[PDB]
Amino acid sequence: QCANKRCIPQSWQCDSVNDCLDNSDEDTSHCASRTCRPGQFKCNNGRCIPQSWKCDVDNDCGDYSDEPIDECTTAAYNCDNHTEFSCKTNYRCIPQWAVCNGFDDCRDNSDEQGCESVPCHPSGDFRCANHHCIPLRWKCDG
Amino acid sequence: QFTCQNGRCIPRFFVCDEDNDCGDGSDEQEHLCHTPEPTCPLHQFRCDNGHCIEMGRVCNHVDDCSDNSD
Amino acid sequence: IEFSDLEGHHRHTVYDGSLPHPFALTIFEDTVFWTDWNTRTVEKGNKYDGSGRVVLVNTTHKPFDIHVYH
Amino acid sequence: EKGCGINECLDSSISRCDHNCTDTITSFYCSCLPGYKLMSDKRSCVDIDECKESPQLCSQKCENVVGSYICKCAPGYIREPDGKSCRQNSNIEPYLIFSNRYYIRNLTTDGSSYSLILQGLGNVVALDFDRVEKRLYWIDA
Amino acid sequence: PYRQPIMSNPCGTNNGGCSHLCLIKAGGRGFTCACPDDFQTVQLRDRTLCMPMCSSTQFLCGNNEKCIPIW
Amino acid sequence: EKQIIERMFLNKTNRETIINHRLRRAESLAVDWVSRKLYWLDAILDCLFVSDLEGRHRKMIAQHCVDANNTFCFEHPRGIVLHPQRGHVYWADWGVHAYIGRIGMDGTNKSVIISTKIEWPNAITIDYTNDLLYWADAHLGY
Numbered sequence: 001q002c003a004n005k006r007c008i009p010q011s012w013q014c015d016s017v018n019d020c021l022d023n024s025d026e027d028t029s030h031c032a033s034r035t036c037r038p039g040q041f042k043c044n045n046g047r048c049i050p051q052s053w054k055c056d057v058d059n060d061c062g063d064y065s066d067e068p069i070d071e072c073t074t075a076a077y078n079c080d081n082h083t084e085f086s087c088k089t090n091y092r093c094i095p096q097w098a099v100c101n102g103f104d105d106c107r108d109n110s111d112e113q114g115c116e117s118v119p120c121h122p123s124g125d126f127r128c129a130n131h132h133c134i135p136l137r138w139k140c141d142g
Numbered sequence: 143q144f145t146c147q148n149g150r151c152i153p154r155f156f157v158c159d160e161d162n163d164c165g166d167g168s169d170e171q172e173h174l175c176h177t178p179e180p181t182c183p184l185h186q187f188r189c190d191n192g193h194c195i196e197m198g199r200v201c202n203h204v205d206d207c208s209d210n211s212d
Numbered sequence: 213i214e215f216s217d218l219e220g221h222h223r224h225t226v227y228d229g230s231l232p233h234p235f236a237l238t239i240f241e242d243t244v245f246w247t248d249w250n251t252r253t254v255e256k257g258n259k260y261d262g263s264g265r266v267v268l269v270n271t272t273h274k275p276f277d278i279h280v281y282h
Numbered sequence: 283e284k285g286c287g288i289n290e291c292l293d294s295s296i297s298r299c300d301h302n303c304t305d306t307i308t309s310f311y312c313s314c315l316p317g318y319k320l321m322s323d324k325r326s327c328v329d330i331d332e333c334k335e336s337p338q339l340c341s342q343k344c345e346n347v348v349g350s351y352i353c354k355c356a357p358g359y360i361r362e363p364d365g366k367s368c369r370q371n372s373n374i375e376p377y378l379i380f381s382n383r384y385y386i387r388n389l390t391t392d393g394s395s396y397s398l399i400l401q402g403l404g405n406v407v408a409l410d411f412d413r414v415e416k417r418l419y420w421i422d423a
Numbered sequence: 424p425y426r427q428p429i430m431s432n433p434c435g436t437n438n439g440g441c442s443h444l445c446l447i448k449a450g451g452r453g454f455t456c457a458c459p460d461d462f463q464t465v466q467l468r469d470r471t472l473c474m475p476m477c478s479s480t481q482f483l484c485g486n487n488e489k490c491i492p493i494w
Numbered sequence: 495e496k497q498i499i500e501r502m503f504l505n506k507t508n509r510e511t512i513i514n515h516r517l518r519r520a521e522s523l524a525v526d527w528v529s530r531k532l533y534w535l536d537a538i539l540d541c542l543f544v545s546d547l548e549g550r551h552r553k554m555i556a557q558h559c560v561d562a563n564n565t566f567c568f569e570h571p572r573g574i575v576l577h578p579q580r581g582h583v584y585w586a587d588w589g590v591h592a593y594i595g596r597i598g599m600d601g602t603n604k605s606v607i608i609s610t611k612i613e614w615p616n617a618i619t620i621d622y623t624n625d626l627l628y629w630a631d632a633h634l635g636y
């Protein structure tokens with residue numbers, strides 16, 4: 001809820017953009033003291049982000065508050081083993097299913113390299129001409 | 143240069159050197175730092191640190207089995 | 213590709229069912245060169261075990277006969 | 283539970299392995315030095331003809347020895363320091379002459395050079411050369 | 424019928440006297456009162472007291488069952 | 495497609511809508527046959543709700559996060575089941591920190607239950623004879 005009693009999505013609060021038309025969401029006093037709700041990391045800028053976006057490599061808070069390199073470069077932020085895929089250049093850990101999905105997930109095209117070698121599921125997959133795997137429910141779907 | 147999980151290029155002189163060079167301990171993970179010992183698995187005897195000697199060398203008064211481990 | 217003594221004894225196999233369709237072959241030094249109809253190729257490998265297989269050229273028409281001029 | 287003291291190789295006319303012997307929990311078995319075969323009597327050893335049995339052990343002409351073999355090289359080849367590979371000596375380097383439909387082609391044996399000897403033939407299915415007169419023969423089927 | 428096994432309801436026949444939600448307490452050995460999404464839970468010595476607190480843009484029912492939006 | 499919860503006898507008669515308001519994206523439900531309650535989850539409000547079976551007296555009984563660290567949070571809650579014998583609600587979540595949560599049937603004593611080797615836990619159930627929990631994962635495929 002804002003000052004003028006119009007209430008907005010909690011993600012837009014202190015997002016550097018005036019939404020409540022009274023600049024209550026971008027007031028420095030509130031944007032400093034406020035605490036991000038459970039599960040979200042807080043930036044020094046006052047923005048709230050999901051905790052999964054710390055060490056995301058990409059900037060989230062605008063001030064690079066979400067990328068402490070020293071912390072992100074230790075063992076404390078390793079990839080989830082046997083469930084996530086690690087990039088080859090950056091320190092990003094991406095969900096494994098994002099490998100070979102027709103999008104640059106690792107930001108250096110690591111996830112989309114050597115796509116011709118990954119085997120599709122023996123029963124529940126359809127193999128594309130560009131060696132992608134799609135769920136069989138999407139063939140002939142239109 | 144072996145590529146650490148966090149993107150550090152480390153020379154192969156430091157892989158499994160019992161020192162965390164990468165900063166995350168990826169270089170010294172157990173995937174490369176197991177180095178299994180001689181199992182001596184089929185059709186021979188085994189004594190001490192993996193001496194896969196033939197069965198005739200069991201307790202035959204000939205100290206070949208490390209420090210006479212049999 | 214098989215070779216044997218001049219009396220047809222002691223046969224040995226170089227390639228074992230790996231060849232589409234050889235038609236001609238020649239040996240020089242330790243290398244055997246053969247012409248393959250199905251891939252339309254000239255290619256070579258070691259004359260005793262077939263190691264180091266290399267496709268020398270992609271002919272558009274069937275290569276029929278081959279010889280080493282030396 | 284027969285012969286459980288292992289030792290059964292340790293006599294002359296009994297066991298009678300002519301090269302070497304090893305004993306199991308119960309009894310002996312015979313063995314030969316390298317390059318000898320256990321023969322079907324299970325007592326005795328024989329020299330293999332390594333030249334006839336395994337010609338791939340020599341790059342060229344092979345000579346049998348009792349207990350081993352020696353690799354020679356045919357006239358015009360030099361034996362490499364490794365003792366197995368023979369290398370052609372004449373400075374005349376070889377090339378592959380091969381025939382296609384409409385073409386006879388001259389290919390160098392590493393794939394680096396690829397040229398044309400003749401073109402506009404009907405169908406060249408066979409081909410051969412003559413060293414003495416530097417001639418070339420073929421069949422236009 | 425076995426995929427919902429029969430067992431004795433702890434709120435049985437009374438809702439434990441709670442005017443609102445009689446829920447099963449954790450461990451499944453006793454009950455516990457509660458209040459709807461826009462009431463204030465107030466505890467007395469022996470009886471829970473849930474009373475409406477709905478907004479200006481919400482309408483409260485005459486017998487205080489619930490609150491509904493003004494529209 | 496209509497954002498409603500209906501009910502009907504099994505002889506196809508007396509079809510009736512019981513909930514139609516303030517229900518954004520209801521992901522799953524289960525029926526407390528014992529104290530007569532309907533429990534459901536929604537992915538947008540990221541909450542666990544409860545009602546009388548007739549739709550009156552709604553309440554929210556879990557929100558924000560599970561655990562004392564906020565490591566596991568309602569993000570994409572999905573399958574739900576009850577174990578009224580022991581007064582527990584179990585539910586799956588397939589967010590970034592995918593997990594299986596548990597809470598008392600009156601909103602106390604919330605906990606994580608499964609937090610490792612779990613990516614896409616769509617399904618959850620209980621075998622009431624063995625008292626064994628079961629789930630399935632759509633990514634790891636187990």
Ligand SMILES: *[C@@H]1O[C@H](CO)[C@@H](O[C@@H]2O[C@H](CO)[C@@H](O[C@@H]3O[C@H](CO[C@H]4O[C@H](CO)[C@@H](O)[C@H](O)[C@@H]4O)[C@@H](O)[C@H](O[C@H]4O[C@H](CO)[C@@H](O)[C@H](O)[C@@H]4O)[C@@H]3O)[C@H](O)[C@H]2NC(C)=O)[C@H](O)[C@H]1NC(C)=O
Nearest residue numbers: 281282374388399400410411412413414415416417418419
């Ligand atoms: C393409 O390549 C071909 C073949 O390599 C060349 O043809 C050769 O040309 C040479 C000349 O450059 C020819 O040499 C001459 O051959 C005559 C005939 O010899 C025949 O009979 C003898 C005896 O039985 C055989 O040994 C021989 O093989 C032949 O069957 C000789 O009589 C000639 O000798 C005369 O001239 C020489 C000087 O040149 C004198 O010393 C002699 O006393 C004598 O007067 C001569 O040797 C050779 O025959 C051709 N090849 C063959 C084998 O037939 C083409 O020239 C070449 N083309 C090009 C353009 O390069």
Ligand SMILES: *[C@@H]1O[C@H](CO)[C@@H](O[C@@H]2O[C@H](CO)[C@@H](O[C@@H]3O[C@H](CO)[C@@H](O)[C@H](O)[C@@H]3O)[C@H](O)[C@H]2NC(C)=O)[C@H](O)[C@H]1NC(C)=O
Nearest residue numbers: 196291299300301302303304305312313314315316318327
């Ligand atoms: C397999 O059989 C051979 C032949 O029987 C065994 O070779 C034996 O090896 C020993 C040690 O090398 C030989 O003794 C040595 O002989 C030389 C003279 O040649 C002498 O100068 C040394 O002081 C020493 O005594 C022995 O002569 C030889 N056997 C015979 C009878 O010639 C070999 O050891 C056997 N291997 C196994 C695994 O059983």
Ligand SMILES: *[C@@H]1O[C@H](CO)[C@@H](O[C@@H]2O[C@H](CO)[C@@H](O[C@@H]3O[C@H](CO)[C@@H](O)[C@H](O)[C@@H]3O)[C@H](O)[C@H]2NC(C)=O)[C@H](O)[C@H]1NC(C)=O
Nearest residue numbers: 424425426427500501502503504505506507508509510525
């Ligand atoms: C789902 O499908 C099953 C199987 O087709 C249905 O079971 C059927 O239920 C009806 C109603 O109870 C049964 O008919 C009744 O049978 C009893 C006993 O013979 C009789 O006394 C009644 O007069 C009536 O004929 C039917 O036999 C039964 N069939 C089977 C194979 O079980 C079930 O009703 C279906 N459920 C729904 C919600 O559609």
Ligand SMILES: *[C@@H]1O[C@H](CO)[C@@H](O[C@@H]2O[C@H](CO)[C@@H](O)[C@H](O)[C@H]2NC(C)=O)[C@H](O)[C@H]1NC(C)=O
Nearest residue numbers: 075076077560561562563564565566605606609
């Ligand atoms: C919840 O948070 C605390 C920190 O406040 C965690 O305790 C630390 O855990 C790490 C390993 O995960 C250790 O290296 C630290 O030394 C611990 N610090 C302290 C003060 O104990 C705790 O592990 C977290 N709980 C769970 C279940 O993950």
Ligand SMILES: *[C@@H]1O[C@H](CO)[C@@H](O[C@@H]2O[C@H](CO)[C@@H](O)[C@H](O)[C@H]2NC(C)=O)[C@H](O)[C@H]1NC(C)=O
Nearest residue numbers: 448449450451580582596598602603604605606
């Ligand atoms: C609240 O949750 C905790 C777990 O987070 C429960 O503790 C477990 O309870 C079972 C059954 O009583 C024990 O067998 C386990 O050893 C307990 N584990 C831990 C880590 O506490 C606890 O029982 C729950 N409380 C209620 C009210 O049911």
Ligand SMILES: *[C@@H]1O[C@H](CO)[C@@H](O)[C@H](O)[C@H]1NC(C)=O
Nearest residue numbers: 080081082083084171172173
């Ligand atoms: C990690 O993943 C590997 C497979 O890449 C697996 O063998 C191993 O058991 C997993 N566990 C850990 C943390 O080593």
Ligand SMILES: *[C@@H]1O[C@H](CO)[C@@H](O)[C@H](O)[C@H]1NC(C)=O
Nearest residue numbers: 253266267268269270271393
């Ligand atoms: C032969 O053709 C293939 C394509 O079919 C090509 O990739 C290859 O490079 C060719 N061989 C050589 C010697 O270039």
Ligand SMILES: *[C@H]1O[C@H](CO)[C@H](O)[C@H](O)[C@H]1NC(C)=O
Nearest residue numbers: 010033034035036037038048
């Ligand atoms: C932030 O944390 C504080 C406690 O320090 C309060 O719980 C506050 O309510 C939290 N923020 C929000 C958005 O609820």
Ligand SMILES: [Ca+2]
Nearest residue numbers: 012015017025
């Ligand atoms: Ca804002």
Ligand SMILES: [Ca+2]
Nearest residue numbers: 056058060066
């Ligand atoms: Ca970031």
Ligand SMILES: [Ca+2]
Nearest residue numbers: 098103105111
């Ligand atoms: Ca991708």
Ligand SMILES: [Ca+2]
Nearest residue numbers: 138140141142
């Ligand atoms: Ca499609």
Ligand SMILES: [Ca+2]
Nearest residue numbers: 156161163169
């Ligand atoms: Ca190291």
Ligand SMILES: [Ca+2]
Nearest residue numbers: 199204206207
């Ligand atoms: Ca010994």
Ligand SMILES: [Ca+2]
Nearest residue numbers: 330347349350
């Ligand atoms: Ca010999």
Ligand SMILES: [Ca+2]
Nearest residue numbers: 537538569570
């Ligand atoms: Ca959500």
